[PDB]
Design a protein around this ligand. Sequence first.
Ligand SMILES: [Ca+2]
Ligand SMILES: [Cl-]
Ligand SMILES: [Cl-]
Length: 448
Amino acid sequence: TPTTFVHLFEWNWQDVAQECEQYLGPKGYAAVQVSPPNEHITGSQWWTRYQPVSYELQSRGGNRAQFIDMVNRCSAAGVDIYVDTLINHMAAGSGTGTAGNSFGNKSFPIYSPQDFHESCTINNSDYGNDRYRVQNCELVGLADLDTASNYVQNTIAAYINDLQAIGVKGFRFDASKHVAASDIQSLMAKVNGSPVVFQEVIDQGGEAVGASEYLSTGLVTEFKYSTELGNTFRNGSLAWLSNFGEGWGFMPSSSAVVFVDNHDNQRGHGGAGNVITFEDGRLYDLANVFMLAYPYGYPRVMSSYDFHGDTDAGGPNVPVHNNGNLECFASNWKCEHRWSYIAGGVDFRNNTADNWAVTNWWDNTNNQISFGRGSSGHMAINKEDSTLTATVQTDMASGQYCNVLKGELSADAKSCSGEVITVNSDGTINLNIGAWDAMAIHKNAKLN
Ligand SMILES: [Ca+2]
Ligand SMILES: [Cl-]
Ligand SMILES: [Cl-]
């Protein structure tokens, strides 16, 4: 069952289509979040994608034709597409868009100065004591659209509805905190059907605007998950995760979009250094294994590129699928969604979707944990400097299982590609996990 989606950060339409047919679809990924496909300002910086000029499908990722082809191809492979939608603003300054359109002085092909909120700057302290300035003033100088305007609403809605007609099944509302929740409601009233919608709202607490205000318009990004998970894995005890989720003050599980990191906090935006990224290697594997195994929220695996200490830089100069050569894992695209442990985690979540409970939780009071998903699957993570050899209780049928984190079951289910885990007649497992390693098994990866 589909349970996880991925963000192919800066991946062009051609790369996404191939990635859907060759890996994402076969591995069970539910969807792919693409970078803004609408016309935006010129420049190699990744953030240019967040400064719109018009809603024409002409961007760094490709043209409209290529965009459509990507939607059809992914759909055919069983993978949905979520479009990152800029519902809060338009580009700053002036210039020409990726489609040739000119803009300046808050004048755009589809917007005039009157369709924007009077200019003012959002100041740090505004987040804490001034709701008005947060949703009416400019975010980093970006022209703040008057989202209360019926015209603006119709324009953004027509954009979303048109994308749905093409086949887009979901949308990410960018900078949703900077847009009044009631404004988003009026917007959703103009949206056809009921597509998947998740709103980006960074709320670590103590904000004038709270994430909970957006629970009626769609899913909401739970940034506490990324920060708290990273802080615990780096500086705390995994044993504290026994009640992760609402127990830590997070939003309801059925409303949250979670992740280990995102393109923003992996480079200092909305997240401190405690956030875990691909740069932390095995630490990243483990955090992902936890997130994917734990039954909280709708997880989005991050897929990035090595920006070489340059937080402004755009992606690699070569595509992912470059003439038969996969530009992954090196100094270009990281392709974390292909990392054995991460992809294995997705397989686990997909096969435990029939039991969203945490059963038989065990820990060594510190950095060793194990828990299951009823009789559907079991897992364990060892982050101590000594081997984890504890015997844990599980609800799984006795037999031999593939550690889906290190391999997979064969076609004839007669063998595994990775290590084998045994469940004794009493349903217990005699763990043997080295330092900084883990294991995960499920009912659909049992040896025949
Ligand atoms: Ca706004
Ligand atoms: Cl192709
Ligand atoms: Cl996000």
